[PDB]
Symmetry: D2
């Protein structure tokens, strides 16, 4: 045993599962707004020997030796991070060790807030993320709502936009120590300047969580939250198209006559290690670094520009076929479809599209509160990486409308949701039209190229 | 732009760094106890298209669709995890989604405790890990100490062993809710039956953090903590020789007048991992973990684990018979806790001189040095070099390279006082820089001849 | 030394201070809405031998012996408490051991809530009490805001009333586990039914803190919060006219087919003792019992009826002289005067009236946020006990208008507040007119009878 | 209705209860260590018009006006409090507003600690008070245990004394922020210098809760904790013989390179009392406290306190020489901790038979009874009866009344098994009810002859 045997030969059971997944990604129409296809260059670094190095600590301040080159790798990742977002190293630092987006956000709260201090984020059904604090009416669900006291703010249901007015009203009463500007299911641009004004008024930190839009921010195709945010967290995948990891950006420098300094760097870095994490995943850090260099490229500006065009084309196509869009349209990479007008819930449309290899996710619509959410969240980044263009997404909307039509017919043939799901498998004619739509979807999808390796 | 361009063509500056790190890995003698060299099969799955799937939730109960393949990969990783540790799927479940060792522990505390509930772990300078609760005297350092109230139990300074008697005394008073039986710098087996007695008395949870010894437990080579513990957390690297990830083992079924009082661990542990703490699972890490878990079920891994112990005893005996004391005496696992206090050098000086000759170790506070900037000795591990087909004679040669290094360190220390004057000495003085560059050339020539798991060039 | 020597003979220094205070109460016009003059019968029990008995525990479940009669005293106090508020002993229990109003409220939070659980009360400048949670924008001030997380609700400044609408909006977002219905500076009737609806919607306990209005509730001259509240706390003084102590009323009995029981009694009683308090003050409990029997009397119904008439007469007199009243008037025992129209702040009017033996307290007016609050809180219970009637309070308003006029003249003669206060003492003519007003106030006040002892 | 009607005319049913309680107080032998009989002067101020003044805030910094007289009464109570304990007003301040002993402690924790900060007090069954932190094994009982994390230190079971050695060991591990040197059932002096050493080591606050011994400290009759403690809380009754209230003593001035690091206790303590925890002060209690504090400055109180000790030693020696063991051996303060385990009766049975003959004591868990429903012995105190002009011969007579009671209890126990069968026995059996009613008649005749502080009829 050398440890150099191929995965094909060493573990054939796992190799056949890698290939069944690679085929599923190649043949499916991937519309999950948070999914992207990582590049082969980054995957090489992700599955490299850097997994073998323990480098607890930070460059130059490591706890062990032999970190000579992984220090260069981490520092290179930090420089490429600041450059991909046009940041001044005198005004901004970055931590590249958060294992993912959720550990990044928990590190910020741990670094700046005391246990049970107050956090405000967009409510979960309104488009926020779990890590922004989420409690049901019966249970603290997000750990952010266990170690800290979270109170959500809401969309204005009439407009589909964040109710910056009600946020200002509630933040003055709730007195939060940190407010989160960032979304998972939101088709619009967050007014970071209005956020920073509410935060300055109530003496709170503004955290911009730009996981979904980071790739767009790096290409300068949408306004940068760095202009108004004290702290910026992000996933290194999604629109950034790297390996799954996280980043924390923070301010440095100067925040009677004396100059008050920014005090984020030491608290943030301490919260990641020693407080929360252990040994950094240097393989992820390296893969993140390759993607961050890919993001300063002109090809990323045109890809991100295409992501916007493709989402608008998908939105425009959806409106023409008679669909409703939460907040009317989109200014970023995703589209919030409201299917309650057309007579179908998102849960039904989710399963039907899943059976025809169209992966999307149900989404609560404003004024809906469920097991049967009324909407669908459709994303452009994944297919746009596969060189999709506007006409390609208009065809994607065609396949979706076919899928919705199939769901409408099954809805009249069924009572409850489980009757609906059971019908898509046992009924012969429904099974047939699904197979016909699925085959046309996969034939259309396989022709497009796919980032990464060819075999796995 | 296709995204299928090779890393060599796409990012040369990066590619050079992956090669330089591969070279330093190859040329060096890795003796850090937590290190290991991963198999090419696992790194193939680590850098797979599995990174491109969001599968929040759990198999059969996920939030997005299209997770049919990753559902089987997670379920496979679960079954391979139970089989690797000889567990009945009726008495044990496992969560394979923790991102690393530290997240796995935080999930267990979240799952079973309320904030500020009481926790007892081995003190950090006594060989415990940060995640077991480490407050200093001025600062709560570990996040375990902030969101929970942790009091440490100590080693007996006379024996180097865990003072199981003091732990029973201080547990009756501190009334902890969970005690952690796990180490990062401890050369002996842990009396898990004695922990379970103290835990059954104060009505506490017995969590076993076998991260450093996960491989030795799977190979049935040291006693298994699963016979006494309710919850077992582990890392998937170190002795398991996998990708960086974590696991949480928990008992399911019936605990015990009345009826069947059930084990309530599973739903709480799974809920703490998601949605409480983590987001989307790292399916590419879960797959590489599964790969390495299959490798741990095979007879080659038991012979590997048995070779780790022998190289450890060989390292200990070879160190004893050259003028070194070892706290706890010998070693019953994979590492040795050397005490450089009886040779006139400290751990900080020794690892800097050893690192300068491609020999990586780490300081470790020994039972006897209140000065923790100049710690007692070093922590040296076997599992890394053992994976390069090292045997006992190769480790007695490593001890010779080490003793030759500390003696360049004993001479360099006789000519200076403070540690930075020490360090600056090792770089400029031509007579010491030459004698270092010569020992370094001989260790690189010696290590390069051995094989190396993984790819050839990165 | 027998311990039976008179205070007159044993400690003459303290005796001369008792008499200087007795004279100050006899000669002053006491307008502090929370002040009342306790009856002699209760004071006898307050300064009795019951101070000498340790009775930790509860009647029948004491931790020591010899509690044979103090058990009868505590149980008698419980029966008179339930009877004074027309409560069914099958539906209501009462704890008579809270040392005061603040320990009563802290016992409720401790009994029903976990540390850091959420509380909502009327904001402090809006008329709430400290124990309802109060944080400045810099410090947690009330211990209620330290051991639990409080968020306040506000008055509607346009109307001076509680914004029950904004409370419902914020309670749905804040998700409090207990909401407090009760005030210190509020001239209106709290809509307890609307409170109970907000509490039932967000699954919160409704605590009615009726310290200021308890005497009115016992006389059935205003609606009883017991009709809508799960828990009722109160001080045993203020409008109840007893010794300084506290009471916690709670529900008993019944809150698939099974009957869910009320679970307040054991948690409330446990929070008082063993958790929070030590040995009960049986001397206070006994004095509280005499006052509670005085409250079931027809004389208390007419006294409380007179308290309402006197406050309305004081309010009507104030309006006629050109004063503003927060929320336009009053339906209870106090009056919130807004002096910002007449050109004087409450802090100035407070000191000027204090120098003429008219004790009131400054009060923040809605839309004012200070060291110079714009209002004055005037109460009727104290003087109404001294047999004041409507024409007497109209004369009190005359003395106040004279005092305000003196403050207006000093305001033009001075710059800052400290200049104002210093002017009332050093300036000769100002000092004179104050002495003339003070003498007329005290001559008018001394003629009225005074509950309690004659000498101390 | 004037409100000046007498209680006899206004509420006869109440008045009868005040008289019945006055009679039972007069007719009985009060031996509860925390009891005492207040002076008529203090009860005159307790039931004064001072109840009718809201004086939220502090002298010079109040929120209402018209507080000129109560400002001097509070300031007098402060000066009398410092003089009574021989404190320089430059090194000590005092807050006289705590409603009782428990509120005074909670204010100190609030003032100096954050929620869930660590606290160490004597364990409750070992003689500590609830307010020092008492969690059982199923429930946080004291509010000190809910809002703060408390670990108890124990007695040495072999000596009955505070195990100061174990406390130093468990303080280095628990890292407390505040340690409480105070007792409710402990017959020895507390090595406050040894507490200050343990506190100065783990960087903790030394709070002294002298509530049970406040009078003996003021009379310079036992060593004063003010020489070693930073904060001293006390009750104003018990040995101080005042109304029910509390005090918080704190150091002000300069603590200690650089300049004058100031004592920061005062503002935090005062702020915790108001506005944090309490509302309007009980000015009638503050005045009665001041009255009793002046009485404690006088030579009659030192002779009184000295008589308390002698009656305590007389009670201890008289109990020893009749077949009783006393934990800790003797007594150096005001109470005696008897152990009825070596005589075949328990504390629950003895206090029920003694209470039935107008002799009030209390159970106390002795060092040796895990069964705490049938506690070891009784706690008996001197300060109560000493205030009735009791001397040593009168206490040796009380011991005779006690020993005659336990022997009716040893015979009643030989004829039954469980405690309720015990209790029901003492009421129906004509031969035991007669023998109880005879001993009762002799104790009432004996106690009634002694004087009684306070009023004559209520
Ligand atoms: N805008 C936005 N869109 C999306 C789309 C996907 N996500 C993330 C998916 C998780 C969010 C989530 C909401 S509810 C809930 C939960 O309690 N689920 C289990 C608990 C496990 C158990 O009890 O077995 C149950 O109670 O069923 C959750 F986990 C988001 C998001 O975060 N935001
Ligand atoms: N509606 C209503 N009316 C009234 C009228 C009187 N009261 C009660 C009086 C207290 C309320 C209070 C508000 S602010 C504050 C405070 O921080 N005061 C000191 C702190 C001490 C120090 O720092 O020396 C300072 O910061 O100046 C307070 F104490 C009330 C009430 O509770 N409600
Ligand atoms: C290494 C280790 C950890 C942490 O593992 P990470 O992957 O660095 O998070 C936790 N516990 C023990 C016992 C360990 O050895
Ligand atoms: C996806 C996301 C996260 C968390 O990312 P993970 O990798 O799943 O931890 C956090 N915030 C936002 C806005 C996200 O979209
Ligand atoms: C009696 C006592 C207390 C409590 O006094 P209370 O007036 O009942 O609150 C607190 N600590 C000690 C040491 C005591 O003896
Ligand atoms: C006066 C009051 C209190 C507290 O009473 P205290 O005796 O000062 O403790 C609590 N709540 C309200 C509404 C009050 O008016």
């Amino acid at each position: 045993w050398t440890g150099q045997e191929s995965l094909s030969d060493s573990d054939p059971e796992m190799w056949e599962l890698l290939q069944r997944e690679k085929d599923r990604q190649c043949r499916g129409l991937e519309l999950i707004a948070s999914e992207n296809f990582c590049s082969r260059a980054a995957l090489e670094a992700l599955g490299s020997c850097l997994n073998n190095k323990y480098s607890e600590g930070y460059p130059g301040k490591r706890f062990y030796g032999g970190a000579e080159v992984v220090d260069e790798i981490e520092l290179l990742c930090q420089r490429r991070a600041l450059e991909a977002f046009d940041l001044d190293p005198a005004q901004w630092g970055v931590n590249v060790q958060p294992y993912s987006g959720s550990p990044a956000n928990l590190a910020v709260y741990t670094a700046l807030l005391q246990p049970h201090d107050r956090i405000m984020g967009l409510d979960l059904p309104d488009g926020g993320h779990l890590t922004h604090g989420y409690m049901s009416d019966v249970k603290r669900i997000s750990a952010t709502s266990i170690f800290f006291e979270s109170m959500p703010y809401k969309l204005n249901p009439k407009t589909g936009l964040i109710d910056y007015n009600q946020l200002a009203l509630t933040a003055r009463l709730f007195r939060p120590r940190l407010i989160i500007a960032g979304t998972s299911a939101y088709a619009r641009l967050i007014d970071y300047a209005r956020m920073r004004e509410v935060c300055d008024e109530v003496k709170a930190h503004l955290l911009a969580d730009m996981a979904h839009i980071s790739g767009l921010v790096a290409a300068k195709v949408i306004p940068s939250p760095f202009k108004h945010a004290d702290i910026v967290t992000t996933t290194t995948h999604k629109t950034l198209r790297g390996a799954r990891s996280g980043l924390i950006f923070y301010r440095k420098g100067v925040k009677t006559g004396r100059e008050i300094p920014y005090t984020f760097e030491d608290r943030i870095n301490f919260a990641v290690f020693p407080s929360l994490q252990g040994g950094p995943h240097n393989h992820a850090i390296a893969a993140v670094a390759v993607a961050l260099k890919q993001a300063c490229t002109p090809m990323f500006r045109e890809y991100s520009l295409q992501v916007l065009k493709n989402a608008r084309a998908m939105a425009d196509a959806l409106l023409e076929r008679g669909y409703s869009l939460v907040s009317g349209g989109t200014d970023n990479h995703l589209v919030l479809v409201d299917l309650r007008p057309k007579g179908l819930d998102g849960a039904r449309a989710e399963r039907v599209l899943e059976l025809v290899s169209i992966t999307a996710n149900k989404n609560t619509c404003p004024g809906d509160r469920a097991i049967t959410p009324g909407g669908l969240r459709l994303g452009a980044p994944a297919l746009t990486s596969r060189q999709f263009r506007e006409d390609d997404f208009r065809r994607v909307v065609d396949f979706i409308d076919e899928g919705v039509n199939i769901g409408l017919e099954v809805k009249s043939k069924t009572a409850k949701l489980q009757d609906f799901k059971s019908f898509l498998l046992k009924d012969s004619e429904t099974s047939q039209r699904l197979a016909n739509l699925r085959q046309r979807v996969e034939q259309f999808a396989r022709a497009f190229p796919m980032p990464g390796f060819d075999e796995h």
